[PDB]
Amino acid sequence: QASVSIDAKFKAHGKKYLGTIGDQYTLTKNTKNPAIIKADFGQLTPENSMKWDATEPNRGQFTFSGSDYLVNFAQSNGKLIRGHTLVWHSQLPGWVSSITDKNTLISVLKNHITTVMTRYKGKIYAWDVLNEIFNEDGSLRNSVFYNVIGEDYVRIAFETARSVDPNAKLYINDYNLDSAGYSKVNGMVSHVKKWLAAGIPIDGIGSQTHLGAGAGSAVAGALNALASAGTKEIAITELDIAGASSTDYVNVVNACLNQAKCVGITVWGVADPDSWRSSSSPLLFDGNYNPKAAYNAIANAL
Numbered sequence: 001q002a003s004v005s006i007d008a009k010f011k012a013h014g015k016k017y018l019g020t021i022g023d024q025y026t027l028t029k030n031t032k033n034p035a036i037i038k039a040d041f042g043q044l045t046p047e048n049s050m051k052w053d054a055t056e057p058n059r060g061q062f063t064f065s066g067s068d069y070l071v072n073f074a075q076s077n078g079k080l081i082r083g084h085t086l087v088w089h090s091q092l093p094g095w096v097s098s099i100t101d102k103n104t105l106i107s108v109l110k111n112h113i114t115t116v117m118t119r120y121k122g123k124i125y126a127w128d129v130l131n132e133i134f135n136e137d138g139s140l141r142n143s144v145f146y147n148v149i150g151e152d153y154v155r156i157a158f159e160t161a162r163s164v165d166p167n168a169k170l171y172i173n174d175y176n177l178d179s180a181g182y183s184k185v186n187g188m189v190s191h192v193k194k195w196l197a198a199g200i201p202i203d204g205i206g207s208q209t210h211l212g213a214g215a216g217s218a219v220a221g222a223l224n225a226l227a228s229a230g231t232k233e234i235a236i237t238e239l240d241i242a243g244a245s246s247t248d249y250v251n252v253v254n255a256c257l258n259q260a261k262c263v264g265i266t267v268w269g270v271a272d273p274d275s276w277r278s279s280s281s282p283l284l285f286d287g288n289y290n291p292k293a294a295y296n297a298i299a300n301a302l
């Protein structure tokens, strides 16, 4: 645990949280990891336990062991929770993707959203309702949901989520929304404006922010562009930067700090060895679960 909490310092600026991720394994693999989570971060996103493959492996049969543990740990330690993720083309069981009847898929979709959301009703700050539904050029990704139901699945997902748990912030999350002017950013913006004008309950846009070295400086403009979509809030949902330079990390933190709609930042992992991009050492804590230079840089910038 780092003596100075970047979550505390970020919150001091009126932000909601500076959080990270976890699940049973990383929360119990050693003593430093859960200790770091409790001392320096204020929000948790389950890395894998709330995904479709882990929650509904078979049609209508739910498995909530992992997700229960994550939610219970967070709730037991005063950490906000971001549910992730309800509708996604990746980590989706074959039984879902093989469905070809529109009404059958809508039924399945609604039951999945309803069961997962109902189980944690009132305990979730934000839900990534839809994840990665855009192609790089801004067009809608041809996933089973898009292919079988059509663009209306967007309305259905958000409306179902809104009625199931009106207390959770409903988000659409995506990656590569990292620079103003990028096609995917333009597509995210124009579509959300359209959906909001039609009455679709979208509370926020989540920008993953999986960066390469040097890409930190363009994030401020990207967030400014995303703010034009018209949602109530936006957030950096899965931050990690290859090389973990102080300049990149501080640039990204300032990007959120200086944009009124950015409620918080979630770093996709605590320590490098547990990163899904471990070979690029993209996190704030190193192989010894000790704060890296960037962590202190972030603290001294707040």
Ligand SMILES: O[C@@H]1[C@@H](O)[C@H](O[C@@H]2CO[C@@H](O[C@@H]3CO[C@@H](O)[C@H](O)[C@H]3O)[C@H](O)[C@H]2O)OC[C@H]1O
Binding pocket: 047, 048, 084, 131, 175, 208, 238, 276
């Ligand atoms: O066996 C499973 C692993 O193969 C799997 O690895 C995870 C893959 O997803 C990672 O999280 C996603 C990263 O990409 C983003 O765009 C998504 O929104 C994230 O959810 C995660 O870090 C990997 O661990 O999951 C774990 C095993 O069950």
Ligand SMILES: O[C@@H]1[C@@H](O)[C@H](O)OC[C@H]1O
Binding pocket: 068, 071, 072, 119, 120, 121, 123
């Ligand atoms: O542990 C579960 C809890 O996480 C959920 O919110 O409510 C039902 C419980 O069984």
